[PDB]
Design a protein around this nucleic acid. Structure first.
Ligand SMILES: [Mg+2]
Ligand SMILES: [Mg+2]
Lengths: 159, 167, 191, 50, 59, 287
RNA sequence: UGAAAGUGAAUGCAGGUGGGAACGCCCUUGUGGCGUGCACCAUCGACCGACCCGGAAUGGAAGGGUUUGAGU
RNA sequence: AUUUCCUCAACCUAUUCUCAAACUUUAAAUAUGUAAGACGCCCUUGUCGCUUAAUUGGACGUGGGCCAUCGAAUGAGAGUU
RNA sequence: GAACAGAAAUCUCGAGUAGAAUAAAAGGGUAAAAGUCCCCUUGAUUUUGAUUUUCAGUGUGAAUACAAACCAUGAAAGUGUG
RNA sequence: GUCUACGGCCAUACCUAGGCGAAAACACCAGUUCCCGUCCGAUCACUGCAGUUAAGCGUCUGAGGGCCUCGUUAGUACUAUGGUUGGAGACAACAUGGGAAUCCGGGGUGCUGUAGGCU
């Protein structure tokens, strides 16, 4: 009871979203991909050509090659006791840029914007992110906000 | 304004429903009556109880427009004595009927060729229905611009001095 | 005790459940009467078979009719046998109902005068069912969703329109004109 | 009888033996690690004498 | 009875010598690239090396 | 038309609902090969209204389309073409105009001049042996059918003769014969200078004079004869080449802005919505 | 190297790039910067054989190739 | 009676009891992919037979400036044969 | 609605999110199409390497993106190695 | 601002009924010689401006249907982790954490890029 055809068990994985069938938005074809870009793989069931295998659906990797209609994407997959370099040729309908990559780009930009300004003002810059610190001391007032005393409620059937 | 009902197309179809020498002579008379080539309607699907030949010509019809369409309609009413009933008119504003013994129309006849029946179906359209028929920017006609049965009956009674059955 | 296994194209060869009638008494009643409802609820997850339900409904119909008549009760069976229990013949064997905790098994709305009678009939049906069940008195009017106090106010304002056994409850939604005509005595207050 | 995630977390906490103890700076990252190992450790606020 | 598959110890075995990661190199083989890109890159690189050589020598 | 029908209904794209954009063709028209990166694909958008011809040179980006150059047949009278502003010849002239406008913008007007005097011969702008390749654009016919002799290829002919490199075969020009697969330059030269319109009027002077007056009323009231038409078109093409620049209009837009607000309806608020809702219920006599 | 008839290894400092042992020099007390760069690995080329090309009786010289070899 | 009556079935509508491993608009928890700069950040200029209308771009480079939270936490020497 | 005479065979007009079709199973996909009809065709071709799946990351099968040719089709962008 | 061409997102844009739309544009609309295609200049092709806002199109209004959004539902359902917890069991409670759907109620009913026209 187990077939190993390419698209076995992809019944929901390769479905277009509800009320998202039909036309493919043409901005997908106008995106530019360069070697070193970090892309997400997300299979469009409406484009049967250039389909990556279902293992790569929802995976993120680096573009190593650019062709007319496709990109080569480097993906590491565990195959035993080690990761293996996989090179998947994907048509650009199944690919999108990682949104964190622009977030990392902008954070670095803001880091150097802070660093240069801190240098000129002759002060520290403190470019390190920090985990959410313990909450600080405050002074909750009760004027016009008097405490309400609660009690546990008695049991009663609501059917 | 431009809310003028006029004839869009007059369709005339043989009601004989036979394939053979009668079918061929039906094309000739359809050609004579219209001045146009009688394209052959086909049999969509064969039936076990009738044995209609698949993808073979069974009926013939032509589409007629223009001023000669009114003439064909006028000579159809004249042989119909300008008498049609209420239920003929369709819910979308079209009307039609059917007359046997097409000899009664003004075409010379001989008893050799055969007797054929010839029907009428007049499609009614105000100007501006091109909106729903053009390929580009194809819209939908507004509700008030559509044609109802009452409108096309009044158009029929406005001219031709016709009357309609009071069922 | 597997995942639900109902009749389907993959399970066409199925027996019919031994219970087919789920409604009893004055089924075509109204809303003004039968104002008090008593429920028999399942206290644990049991698998009541259609035989056990069919046995209960026959017992409940006979006792209730003899004691109060036919026009003073609206007995109905909530549980439905849709799961198919299999067996090896001497393949499907029977139909059972998967009822969770707090699922109503039989609900009867009667008069407040028949409050004690409705309790007793619903109490006897516990001996037919497996597992444990409790008798509770509904805080809702019959088979509606509203409390008795609220339903009274909706009835006194004039926003309730009787439709057979059930009814129509006005809402702030839809074309006004239809709502106006339908509710004659109701006051569409302008705020 | 230590499952893999908790075993790794106690290694990262340098809590390798029973009754071992460490000081940890309390932040959101440390707090979520201690949540995973709640059955295996105990922790609280130490005073100056401690 | 044969056909006795199980994954119970397999994940433990994989982690004994860990999930190894492949070595990352500065340069990957251009045999994975488009052949037209690869052919022209040979000429571009050859000219860059020639130009770097001349500028150092003529300095 | 139940609620579940509406709930599950998926609308087509907006420009597909209004029957304007063929997205199947649009994708193939503008989709650059990814290893050419940000080199834009340029379309020659040619559109016809009932009275005028629209020629645009467009590239596509993620956020929308960008017009490199434009030419409108409404600007032809400035060059001397005031009648037949929607015919095959007007399509030709407005194509030549946008071709000269685009080339100046990309700085290639002097290097690629196309045909100065068209003779209706099929040719593409050849690339200079040692120099820039010609500006390349692809024909975007929209929803118009590409039958032989269609006006979209007239504007494509005009733009090609203007120096733009447009790939095309002459299989859809007027006068091309599908039986012999040969192009008759005579009819094609005739269409370029508007002779087909010249022959129509001349036919109408011979028979049905009342039809002639009703048809070319715009050309009559200027006293234009069929012999003049070739001269006007030939001179206009020359005037287009000498000065192709688009003169930016100086009409006051603020006046149009202020005028259009006066006729612009306003949208009601909740306070008024409560007012009219009470009034209608009051007038219904049911409160 | 090729089944074989056969043919048979330097454009260059026996090449370029990245990391790099050891050594030298500058800082200024840092997990430094700078210059050579052994071994090894990754990588772009060159050279020999096979193969696939065009290709101006016998020979295959210059020009090539996504390739190929347990080569230099 | 091509004029009707109802139990007869059929269908339409609005309510209404109850379900799905091989139903579904939604949609968790847990699990899971990637990233957290020195192979990094800004300009000058070089190469090419690829690509562009085009030194246009792409790829690889050169030379200069940012080495003081070198860019979340925690921990720990690591990898190849 | 029109015929003919039950027959919704045929024809006409409206509504119609696909509830049809798409060779054969099921699932996925598809509406100016991937469905139906029409026109032209042989990319169901020759050659090389790279890649994915099963996987030992061996073979076999099947599949993807390219490259060097030669072609089909289209006005063209393109599309086509069943 | 309005309109037109080409778009981006692809219903806060769809469907429905009814009110308004000056200018320009768009449209309907006048013809069939040429190009072209049809049983049929209906459509598709050309060639035009006599006529019309009436249809399309635009905008406004429905205690409209759908759609979008925020709250209630509800920390409820479910769930990671824990106990030599309860209970014959079915399950349940508790502990350290994560946390819906649906219905119902309120609000909303396209925004925007490029290029060019318009009392
Ligand atoms: Mg538990
Ligand atoms: Mg334990």
């Amino acid at each position: 009871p187990h077939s190993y055809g390419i698209r076995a068990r992809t019944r929901y994985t390769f479905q277009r979203g509800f009320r998202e069938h039909g036309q493919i938005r043409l901005s997908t074809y106008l995106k530019t991909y360069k070697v070193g870009d970090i892309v997400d793989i997300k299979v469009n069931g409406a484009v049967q050509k250039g389909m990556p295998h279902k293992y790569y659906h929802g995976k993120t990797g680096v573009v190593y090659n650019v062709t007319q209609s496709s990109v080569g994407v480097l993906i590491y997959k565990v195959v035993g006791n080690r990761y293996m370099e996989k090179r998947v040729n994907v048509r650009i309908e199944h690919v999108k840029h990682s949104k964190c990559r622009q977030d990392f780009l902008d954070r670095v930009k803001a880091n150097e914007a802070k660093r240069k300004e801190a240098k000129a003002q002759g002060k520290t810059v403190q470019l390190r992110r920090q985990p959410a610190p313990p909450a600080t001391a405050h002074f909750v007032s009760t004027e016009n906000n008097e405490p309400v005393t609660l009690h546990p409620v008695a049991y009663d059937t609501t059917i | 304004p431009m809310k003028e009902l006029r004839i869009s197309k007059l369709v005339l179809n043989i009601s004989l429903g036979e394939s053979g020498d009668r079918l061929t002579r039906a094309a000739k008379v359809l050609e004579q009556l219209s001045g146009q080539t009688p394209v052959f309607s086909k049999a969509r699907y064969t039936i076990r109880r009738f044995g209609i030949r698949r993808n073979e010509k069974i009926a013939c019809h032509v589409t007629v427009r223009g001023p000669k369409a009114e003439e064909i309609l006028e000579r159809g009413l004249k042989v119909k004595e300008y008498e049609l009933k209420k239920r003929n008119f369709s819910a979308t504003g079209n009307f039609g009927f059917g007359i046997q013994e097409h000899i009664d129309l003004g075409i010379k006849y001989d008893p050799s060729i055969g007797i054929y029946g010839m029907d009428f179906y007049v499609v009614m359209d105000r100007p501006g229905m091109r909106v729903a028929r053009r390929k580009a920017q194809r819209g939908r006609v507004g509700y008030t611009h559509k044609i109802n049965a009452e409108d096309t009956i009044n158009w029929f009674k406005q001219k031709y001095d016709a009357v309609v059955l009071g069922k | 005790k597997n995942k639900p296994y109902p009749k389907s194209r993959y399970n066409r060869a199925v027996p019919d459940s031994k219970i087919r009638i789920f409604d009893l008494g004055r089924k075509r009643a109204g809303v003004d009467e039968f104002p008090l409802c008593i429920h028999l609820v399942s206290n644990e997850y049991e698998q009541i078979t259609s035989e056990a339900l069919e046995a209960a409904r026959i017992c409940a119909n006979k006792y209730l009719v003899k004691i109060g008549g036919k026009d003073s009760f609206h007995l109905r069976v909530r549980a439905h046998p849709f799961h198919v229990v299999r067996i090896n013949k001497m393949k499907p064997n029977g139909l059972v109902a998967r009822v969770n905790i707090g699922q109503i098994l039989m609900s009867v709305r009667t008069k407040d005068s028949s409050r004690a009678t409705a309790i007793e009939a619903l109490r006897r049906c516990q001996y037919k069912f497996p597992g444990q069940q409790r008798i509770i008195v509904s805080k809702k009017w019959g088979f509606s969703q509203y409390a008795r106090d609220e339903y009274i106010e909706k009835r006194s304002r004039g926003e309730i329109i009787p439709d057979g056994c059930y009814a129509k409850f006005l809402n702030k939604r839809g074309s006004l004109q239809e709502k106006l005509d339908l509710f004659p005595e109701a006051s569409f207050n302008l705020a | 009888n230590i499952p893999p995630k908790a075993r790794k977390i106690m290694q990262l906490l340098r809590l390798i033996q029973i009754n071992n103890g460490v000081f940890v700076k309390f932040n959101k990252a440390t707090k979520e690690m201690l949540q995973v190992v709640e059955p295996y450790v105990t922790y609280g606020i130490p005073n100056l004498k401690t | 009875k044969s056909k006795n598959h199980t994954n119970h110890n397999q994940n433990k075995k994989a982690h004994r010598n860990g999930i190894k990661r492949p070595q990352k190199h500065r340069y990957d083989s251009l045999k994975y690239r488009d052949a037209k890109f690869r052919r022209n890159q040979k000429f571009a690189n050859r000219g860059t090396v020639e130009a770097i050589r001349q500028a150092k020598a003529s300095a | 038309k139940s609620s579940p029908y509406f709930s599950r209904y998926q609308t087509k794209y907006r420009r597909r609902r209004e029957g304007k954009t063929d997205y199947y063709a649009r994708k193939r028209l503008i989709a650059q090969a990814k290893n050419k990166y940000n080199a834009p694909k340029y379309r020659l958008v040619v559109r016809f209204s009932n009275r005028f011809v629209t020629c645009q040179i467009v590239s596509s980006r993620v956020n929308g389309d960008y017009v490199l150059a434009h030419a409108h047949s409404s600007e032809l009278p400035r060059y001397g073409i005031k009648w037949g502003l929607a015919n095959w010849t007007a399509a030709y002239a407005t194509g030549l105009l946008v071709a000269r406008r685009a080339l100046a913008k990309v700085g290639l007007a002097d290097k690629y001049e196309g045909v100065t005097e068209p003779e209706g011969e099929f040719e593409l702008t050849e690339a200079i042996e040692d120099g820039p390749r010609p500006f390349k654009v692809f024909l975007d016919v929209g929803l118009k059918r590409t039958s032989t002799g269609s006006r979209v290829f007239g504007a494509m002919k005009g733009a090609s003769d203007g120096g733009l490199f447009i790939p095309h075969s002459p299989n859809r020009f007027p006068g091309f014969d599908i039986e012999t697969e040969e192009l008759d330059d005579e009819t094609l030269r005739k269409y370029i200078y508007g002779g087909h319109v010249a022959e129509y009027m001349e036919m109408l002077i011979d028979d049905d004079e009342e039809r002639y007056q009703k048809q070319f009323s715009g050309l009559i009231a200027d006293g234009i004869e069929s012999d003049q038409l070739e001269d006007i078109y030939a001179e206009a093409y020359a005037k287009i080449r000498e000065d192709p620049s688009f003169q930016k209009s100086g009409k006051d837009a603020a006046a149009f802005k202020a005028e259009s607000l006066k006729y612009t309806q306003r949208k009601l608020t909740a306070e008024e919505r409560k007012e009219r809702f009470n009034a209608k219920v009051i007038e219904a006599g049911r409160a």
